[PDB]
Amino acid sequence: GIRKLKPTTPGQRHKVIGAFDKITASTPEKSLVVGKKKTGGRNNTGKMTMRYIGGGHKQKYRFIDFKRTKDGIPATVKTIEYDPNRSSRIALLYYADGAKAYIIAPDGLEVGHTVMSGSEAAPEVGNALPLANIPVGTIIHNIELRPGQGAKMVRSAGSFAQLTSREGTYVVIKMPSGEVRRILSTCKATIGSVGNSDHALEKSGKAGRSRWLGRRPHNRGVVMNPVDHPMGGGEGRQSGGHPRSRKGLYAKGLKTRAPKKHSSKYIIERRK
Amino acid sequence: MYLDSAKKAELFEKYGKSVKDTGSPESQIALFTFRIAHLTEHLRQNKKDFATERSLKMLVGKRRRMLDYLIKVDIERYRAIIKELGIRR
RNA sequence: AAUAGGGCCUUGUACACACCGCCCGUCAAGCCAUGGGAGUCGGGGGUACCUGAAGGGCGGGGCGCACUAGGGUAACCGGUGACUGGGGCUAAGUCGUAACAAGGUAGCCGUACCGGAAGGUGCGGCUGGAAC
RNA sequence: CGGGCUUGAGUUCAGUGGCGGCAGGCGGAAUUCGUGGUGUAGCGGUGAAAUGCAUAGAUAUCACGAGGAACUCCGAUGCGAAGGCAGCUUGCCAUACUGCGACUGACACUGAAGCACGAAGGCGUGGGUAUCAAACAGGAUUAGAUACCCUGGUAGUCCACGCAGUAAACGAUGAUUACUAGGAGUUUGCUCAAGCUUCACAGCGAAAGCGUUAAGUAAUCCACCUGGGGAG
RNA sequence: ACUAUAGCUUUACAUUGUAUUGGAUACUAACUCGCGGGCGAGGACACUGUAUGGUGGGUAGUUU
RNA sequence: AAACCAGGCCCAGGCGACUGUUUAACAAAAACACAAGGCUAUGCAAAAAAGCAAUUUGAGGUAUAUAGUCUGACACCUGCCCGGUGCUGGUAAAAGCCCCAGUAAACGGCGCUAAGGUAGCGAAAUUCCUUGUCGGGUAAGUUCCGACCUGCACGAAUGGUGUAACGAUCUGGGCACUGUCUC
RNA sequence: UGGUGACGGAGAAGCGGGCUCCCAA
RNA sequence: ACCCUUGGUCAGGUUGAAGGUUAGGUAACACUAACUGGAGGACCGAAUCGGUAAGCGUUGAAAAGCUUUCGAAUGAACUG
Numbered sequence A: 001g002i003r004k005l006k007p008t009t010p011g012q013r014h015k016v017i018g019a020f021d022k023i024t025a026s027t028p029e030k031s032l033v034v035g036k037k038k039t040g041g042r043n044n045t046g047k048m049t050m051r052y053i054g055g056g057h058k059q060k061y062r063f064i065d066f067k068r069t070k071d072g073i074p075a076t077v078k079t080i081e082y083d084p085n086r087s088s089r090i091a092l093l094y095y096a097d098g099a100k101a102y103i104i105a106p107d108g109l110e111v112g113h114t115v116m117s118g119s120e121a122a123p124e125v126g127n128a129l130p131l132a133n134i135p136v137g138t139i140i141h142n143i144e145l146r147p148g149q150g151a152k153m154v155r156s157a158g159s160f161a162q163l164t165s166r167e168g169t170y171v172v173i174k175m176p177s178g179e180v181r182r183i184l185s186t187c188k189a190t191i192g193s194v195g196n197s198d199h200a201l202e203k204s205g206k207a208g209r210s211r212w213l214g215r216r217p218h219n220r221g222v223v224m225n226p227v228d229h230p231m232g233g234g235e236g237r238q239s240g241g242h243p244r245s246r247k248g249l250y251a252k253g254l255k256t257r258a259p260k261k262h263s264s265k266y267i268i269e270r271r272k
Numbered sequence B: 001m002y003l004d005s006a007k008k009a010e011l012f013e014k015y016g017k018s019v020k021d022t023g024s025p026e027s028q029i030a031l032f033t034f035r036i037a038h039l040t041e042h043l044r045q046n047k048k049d050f051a052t053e054r055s056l057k058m059l060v061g062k063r064r065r066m067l068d069y070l071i072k073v074d075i076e077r078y079r080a081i082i083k084e085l086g087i088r089r
Numbered sequence C: 001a002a003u004a005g006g007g008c009c010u011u012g013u014a015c016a017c018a019c020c021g022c023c024c025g026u027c028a029a030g031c032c033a034u035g036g037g038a039g040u041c042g043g044g045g046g047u048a049c050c051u052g053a054a055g056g057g058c059g060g061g062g063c064g065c066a067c068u069a070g071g072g073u074a075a076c077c078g079g080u081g082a083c084u085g086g087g088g089c090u091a092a093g094u095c096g097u098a099a100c101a102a103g104g105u106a107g108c109c110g111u112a113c114c115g116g117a118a119g120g121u122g123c124g125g126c127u128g129g130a131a132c
Numbered sequence D: 001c002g003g004g005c006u007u008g009a010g011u012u013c014a015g016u017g018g019c020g021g022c023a024g025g026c027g028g029a030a031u032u033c034g035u036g037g038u039g040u041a042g043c044g045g046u047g048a049a050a051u052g053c054a055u056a057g058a059u060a061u062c063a064c065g066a067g068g069a070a071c072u073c074c075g076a077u078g079c080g081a082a083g084g085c086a087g088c089u090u091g092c093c094a095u096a097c098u099g100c101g102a103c104u105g106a107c108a109c110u111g112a113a114g115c116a117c118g119a120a121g122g123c124g125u126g127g128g129u130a131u132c133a134a135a136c137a138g139g140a141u142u143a144g145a146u147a148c149c150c151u152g153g154u155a156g157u158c159c160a161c162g163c164a165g166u167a168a169a170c171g172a173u174g175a176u177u178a179c180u181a182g183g184a185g186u187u188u189g190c191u192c193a194a195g196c197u198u199c200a201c202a203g204c205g206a207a208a209g210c211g212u213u214a215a216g217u218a219a220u221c222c223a224c225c226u227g228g229g230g231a232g
Numbered sequence E: 001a002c003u004a005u006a007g008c009u010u011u012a013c014a015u016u017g018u019a020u021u022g023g024a025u026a027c028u029a030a031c032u033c034g035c036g037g038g039c040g041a042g043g044a045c046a047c048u049g050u051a052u053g054g055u056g057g058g059u060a061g062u063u064u
Numbered sequence F: 001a002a003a004c005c006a007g008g009c010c011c012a013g014g015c016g017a018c019u020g021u022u023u024a025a026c027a028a029a030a031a032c033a034c035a036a037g038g039c040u041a042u043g044c045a046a047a048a049a050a051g052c053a054a055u056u057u058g059a060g061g062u063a064u065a066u067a068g069u070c071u072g073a074c075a076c077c078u079g080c081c082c083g084g085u086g087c088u089g090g091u092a093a094a095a096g097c098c099c100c101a102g103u104a105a106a107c108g109g110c111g112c113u114a115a116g117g118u119a120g121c122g123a124a125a126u127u128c129c130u131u132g133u134c135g136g137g138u139a140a141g142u143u144c145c146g147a148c149c150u151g152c153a154c155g156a157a158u159g160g161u162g163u164a165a166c167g168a169u170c171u172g173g174g175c176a177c178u179g180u181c182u183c
Numbered sequence G: 001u002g003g004u005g006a007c008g009g010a011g012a013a014g015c016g017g018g019c020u021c022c023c024a025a
Numbered sequence H: 001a002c003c004c005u006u007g008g009u010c011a012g013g014u015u016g017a018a019g020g021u022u023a024g025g026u027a028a029c030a031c032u033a034a035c036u037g038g039a040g041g042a043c044c045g046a047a048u049c050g051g052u053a054a055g056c057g058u059u060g061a062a063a064a065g066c067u068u069u070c071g072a073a074u075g076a077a078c079u080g
């Protein structure tokens, strides 16, 4: 759900934000949060390697459980919670042993539900199973790439993948980008799609909101001088020629995947 | 609605003289009100059941006609039945 | 010596000096009525404000009420205007042939897109259509 | 105005339905693309051709993988206020017809304003995108072809929510009630009653024709017309 | 503009081995990655060194 | 309103939606940014950026994400061209190159070619001739506003045409007011 | 081994601070 | 100049979004009325940040200032 702001201000006329309807708690679990220090896009030499990063609201880091190791121990959903670090919401789980954890909240998960992990776990929403136990055709997220490493694949708000066929020790999965690829049957995934699918409908409305989110203004290359950018220069407006970066990397069709990568043997169809 | 024979018999027993009073006012009113409530609860979930919506409007008209007949007959029964069921809104 | 078009029926018609028929639209010509516009010029009434005669009222003065006169904003009723677009009738000069026969791609209704022009095409509907 | 009656109207019960509405699942044929076997001089299209695909390897043919749309035979009849509704199944709704020896007692009809629904095409946001296909591009025929024919092809066609409110939205025939002749079929409930369509008395009509589903005989209310253009 | 050149990229040799009907397949033991404090996934490829062919105003020295 | 203190107002245009930023010390703007839109890359030791490397940023984020590039709220829209240039494909002891196919919200073009400028604008921040011509305003108008279209040399995301609100922006006209001026 | 430490912004209220709300958390 | 960590500051007045309550209205929503509420790169304006226009200064009080005027002033704010 989203909320549109009435046009009492020019900076509010085009603002659309979320309704925060699924959030049930206002403060985070203390044992699972730590203060976060911001980079301005600078690496360990102090030189800025990534542009347009800096400022924004102070944030705390929530430790998200992407491994789901406690197999067979049931957990109960305590609260649905806001996370400043990612687009999706998180869910606080209490285990029967007194452990507490955070997971990425799937769509349709409510307070009071029970989740499990492992081969014995039922293929319902919020359960984390090896892909060899997931019946063909269901909607999954938080997909592992190597057994035991942790979820890497389907994590953003609203995104989902589908398990379409299994071929021996591998399964065929269609990815959010449209790629079709093989994943080992030992890898884990969580049933359901990621919640908060209305994230893409939000509109900032003003430059200040990007400043709050921690982004700095971006300058086009055509309005620089030739000493700063290949596309710069000229008197009056000029098109800049073929679009390219500061180092001259073409920006309108040149592929940059390494064309000898071993992971190509596990890709069936390509869409990126 | 559920509209069971037991529910209809209980409604008739509560409203009107004896169970056999199936076709009298203050009992047709109660049956129509029950059906209207159940149809509203059904249309809350099925927002495209336009046939059910039209049937609900017909039931509302039928209850209005029975209430007008009660108006023509007297006013005490009118006041009693509307105070009991809950009508004016 | 060598070699193997016309009548009688059923149909449709916007034709009837009768298909060598009748009609549709565009552009160019001439008359008439009515539209739209930077602006410009008036008339009648209205709300407020400022002054305000005579005659009475209240208190020789003072203060009231309103007949007008004055400014200004708002209506309605009207004229005119660089320029720019429909319609009718008379001519018919030009360009094609859309409809009337299965009118030569059946026709019409709605809708959308596209063309000098009548129109063409897509989707759904109708017979006020053949022909099977 | 004050009472009564049950025949009209409505409620209940039983039986009989149904391409009626909404929602969730399941399907095979055809067809599209990608990746691999076989194989090579054409395929496709037309009145005849050409534009197009194809030896840096087509059509055809055998597989595997990823998808979208439509529901052959039954199938002409039935349902819905209308628009409309057709693969299989389930759930939730609505509704109709017939009867009861059950009930209430005229509670009825119509309806200017208003409200609701309302084919196709069209608009907005998000998905999806196989076929067909406006616009557009090329090839033909013609004096020309801004068309008809052929090859491509984007919106659209599909889904969800929201606008829009139009049609040859037609039976070119408003709703209700009562009555009035026969033939040919058909469906359901059982010789009878509902419904479904064409010949046809009286009657009506200018005629074509309508004729128990009237355009016949009558009563109640609503909508609309008053010569053709201009002009919806 | 002339000449170079970082980077990217192609092949050969080295790292680098074994079998079967050569250039394909297969194997695991070199080599790489993940998990836990051996197991799993790859695999003679990838990576890197030497040589070689392309590309290279990204950078440099110059000429005009 | 008693001193001090304490909005001038209206009509009509160009540009840029807006609040913001900028040449410390001659330029505050129509320049930059911006919310938003498109295209392209990237399946995660991601692409990309620093570094000889180790390592770090990206990001401990995972395609509703990140990065490169152009356009720049919103409304109605965004026409034809793949010929050219880019881009994507099918020698030492094979890449390329050729050829063919695709790509214009890629650079670019829209007078016999690849295609001959669609809608919308137009003496314009674009018009040389030029103070173009007609109308409005003034006693008198090289500026301004409205039309006309031989557009030297507009034109649709180096976006076209509009647009309420906003501006120490540029530009024209009125009322008020005055030593700006007659002086 | 578990709690405190330990945390935002705006605004009621107390000559004669709790608290409420909000999202940028 | 930009970034990182950790602190601080912003007189007074105005306007009146979301939301809430109570009335009518609905089959239920919808939808009107009043009060409440206090949002905002909102408005006026001190401190403060900045530097529009004019005047003065130009061996200046000053190697960039002063006076008047003017912009922003809860934020993409200023500052240790």
Ligand SMILES: [K+]
Pocket: A218, A219, A220
């Ligand atoms: K920019």
Ligand SMILES: [K+]
Pocket: A226, A229, A230
């Ligand atoms: K350069």
Ligand SMILES: [K+]
Pocket: C097, C103
């Ligand atoms: K013709």
Ligand SMILES: [K+]
Pocket: C105
């Ligand atoms: K024809």
Ligand SMILES: [K+]
Pocket: C125, D169
């Ligand atoms: K119809």
Ligand SMILES: [K+]
Pocket: none
């Ligand atoms: K007949």
Ligand SMILES: [K+]
Pocket: F014
């Ligand atoms: K001008």
Ligand SMILES: [K+]
Pocket: none
């Ligand atoms: K612009």
Ligand SMILES: [K+]
Pocket: none
């Ligand atoms: K274009």
Ligand SMILES: [K+]
Pocket: none
């Ligand atoms: K200071």
Ligand SMILES: [Mg+2]
Pocket: A223, A224, A225
């Ligand atoms: Mg510059």
Ligand SMILES: [Mg+2]
Pocket: A235, A236, A237
């Ligand atoms: Mg220039």
Ligand SMILES: [Mg+2]
Pocket: C027, C028
């Ligand atoms: Mg002519």
Ligand SMILES: [Mg+2]
Pocket: none
């Ligand atoms: Mg140089």
Ligand SMILES: [Mg+2]
Pocket: none
């Ligand atoms: Mg030298």
Ligand SMILES: [Mg+2]
Pocket: F016
């Ligand atoms: Mg500006």
